[PDB]
């Protein structure tokens, strides 16, 4: 599954980052794309998702108002803009594509992560 996340790096608190999630364009796994994050020693945390039925945007309460998810479409890419970052947003960020089940479980198809470190 080729779903590479990029855009990570070192950032100071209050800064912004724009992450990128480049989908196949050849294969679709495929109606929903979400961002997750995983920090050392913590549980995986869902961040945000964009789902086509008309474009629906979802945000975890912990990033609502600070993060924005969007799609370029022409480039088969989903973006996550993260604003007013804080130390607790430090983590590896990665994408999954899946078919929205509206049920208990989903089957995610995972991409590779990009590292985001918010520090002084």
């Amino acid at each position: 599954v080729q779903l590479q996340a990029s855009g990570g790096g070192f950032v100071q608190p209050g800064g912004s980052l724009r992450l990128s999630c480049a989908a196949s364009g050849t294969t679709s796994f495929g109606d929903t794309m979400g961002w997750f994050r995983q920090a050392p020693g913590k549980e995986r945390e869902f961040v945000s998702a964009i789902s086509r039925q008309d474009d629906s945007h979802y945000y975890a309460d912990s990033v609502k108002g600070r993060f924005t998810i969007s799609r370029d479409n022409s480039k088969n890419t989903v973006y996550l803009q993260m604003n007013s970052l804080r130390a607790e947003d430090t983590a590896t960020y990665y994408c999954a594509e899946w078919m929205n089940t509206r049920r208990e479980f989903i089957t995610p198809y995972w991409g590779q992560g990009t590292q985001v470190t918010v520090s002084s």
């Binding site: 997750f36 789902s51 945000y59 049920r103 208990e104 479980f105 989903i106 995610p108 198809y109």
Partner: peptide, 14 residues
């Protein structure tokens, strides 16, 4: 990958 809890349950969309 293996199935995981559906993360969109309980969330509003915009």
């Amino acid at each position: 990958g293996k199935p995981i809890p559906n993360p969109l349950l309980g969330l509003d969309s915009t």
